[PDB]
């Protein structure tokens, strides 16, 4: 059924599973028209489909042309997400297909269930975890590929860089969610924490900086402090 903190280790077992987050599929800027009405302008978006055990990220870039002449875009976006996740599953070899797909938002359940009727043995599940995957577009290299896209495109990343050489999947996911939560809460300060040190760099083939084990402990502590600091500012604590 629903996925929560009681069954959290299930994410790192040997049953292939994917998280699907649709919060960056349909992205708009709101602006005034010449006549003083309000209009939206879409910008390119993306589906965030992540294997939390391996770090493999299937980033489907949603180019603004998919919305052209369509109505009810917020509704259509859920169905387009479902269509694309279904197409990804069909594209994978059988032994790579997931046994479970966990959607971050419950509004994705029916669209994905309906698109996956041909896969009755793939469980479609909600989660009670609040996961910060909306902040994926704060990762510079992910935002860059989305905004430069001129057509629909799938790009594959490992969102853990090379961390699984040194840490477990459970720990890698915890580091990822901490980084994304910090970027969601205060993007400027999070990026300052990650990139201000001039002796630390991001490898061409990575998303995050090349921190040593001890440097990651310091970074993780700084990210926790940021989150707590922002919580205090928010609630006046």
């Amino acid at each position: 059924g629903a996925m929560n903190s009681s069954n959290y280790a299930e994410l790192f077992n040997n049953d292939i599973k994917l998280f699907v987050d649709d919060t960056n599929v349909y992205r708009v800027t709101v602006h005034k028209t010449f006549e003083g009405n309000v209009a939206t302008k879409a910008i390119n978006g993306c589906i965030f489909t992540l294997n939390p055990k391996t770090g493999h990220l299937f980033l489907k870039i949603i180019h603004t042309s998919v919305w052209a002449g369509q109505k009810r875009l917020s509704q259509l976006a859920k169905w387009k997400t479902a269509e694309e996740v279904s197409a990804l599953v069909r594209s994978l070899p059988k032994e790579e297909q997931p046994k479970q797909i966990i959607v971050t938002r419950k509004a994705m359940l029916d669209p994905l269930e309906v698109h996956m009727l041909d896969f009755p043995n793939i469980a479609i599940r909600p989660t009670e975890l609040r996961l910060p995957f909306s902040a994926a577009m704060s990762i510079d290299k992910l935002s860059d590929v989305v905004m430069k896209a001129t057509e629909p495109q799938m790009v594959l990343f490992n969102i853990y860089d090379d961390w699984l050489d040194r840490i477990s999947s459970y720990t890698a996911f915890s580091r990822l969610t901490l980084l994304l939560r910090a970027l969601k809460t205060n993007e400027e300060s999070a990026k300052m924490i990650l990139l201000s040190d001039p002796t630390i760099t991001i490898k061409s083939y990575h998303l995050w900086p090349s921190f040593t084990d001890e440097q990651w402990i310091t970074i993780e502590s700084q990210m926790r402090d940021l989150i707590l600091t922002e919580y205090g500012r928010k609630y006046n604590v």
Binding site: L76, W79, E83, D110, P111, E113, V114, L117, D118
Partner: protein, 300 residues
Amino acid sequence: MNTVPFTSAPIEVTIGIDQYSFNVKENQPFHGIKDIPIGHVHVIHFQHADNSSMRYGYWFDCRMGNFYIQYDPKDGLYKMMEERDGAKFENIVHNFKERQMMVSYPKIDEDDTWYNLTEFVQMDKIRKIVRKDENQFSYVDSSMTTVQENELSDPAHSLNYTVINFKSREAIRPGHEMEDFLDKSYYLNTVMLQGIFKNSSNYFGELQFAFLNAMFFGNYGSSLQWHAMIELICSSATVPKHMLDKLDEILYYQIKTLPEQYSDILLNERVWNICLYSSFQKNSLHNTEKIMENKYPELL
């Protein structure tokens, strides 16, 4: 006008005939029901006084044979049987009619209620939902499960209603996922009407039979079928105008007849609120909406 005689009434029981009902005491000299209107199916139903768990009954048409009821003390129920000897049936009926041991089907002349509830219900279609081919009448009870219920257990005792499932490959054309899920017209018109039922009359007959079973026997599976068949029409953007107008009439009389005190267990709030206020057909069921709002405003 036809007659269903009773050998005896050895156990105290509430007997229903269509929408009417009456109480018979243990060993009372009750010998059946006369003046049953020819031209309609009928249902004769039972709930034992000493065990209300016993709710069951028989659908029948007096045009298809002569039927009588006798208590079976081994199986503990009133059983319908068919009489093949016509002259005997008439002599036994006349004898009891002369001694005034029968209740009269109490139809008021102005009253079209039963016709309105059974307009599309035919015995031949009943006998395909309820499979017991050796009898011309059909037994139904409170606990019988539907085929769809059994997929989610004895198949011979099942209600073979047409399976309706909005999240099934039958309902959703590959490549038309959003279209077919948000607008069920394909499923209603091509799959169900043109494909399975052949016409709206058969669809409405099953809808009406499901409602009657749910209301007379307190059968849960029937109630799920009745609501599903309503929701399928209401959730379709393209429905023939004659079907919408006829559905409004069908539901009006169903809601009118439902016992007020059973509304909590016979009406699904989600389905009715969706159908009356959110669906494509939210403005197409004026008579049903008006009676629902005046009679069961709490549900809404």
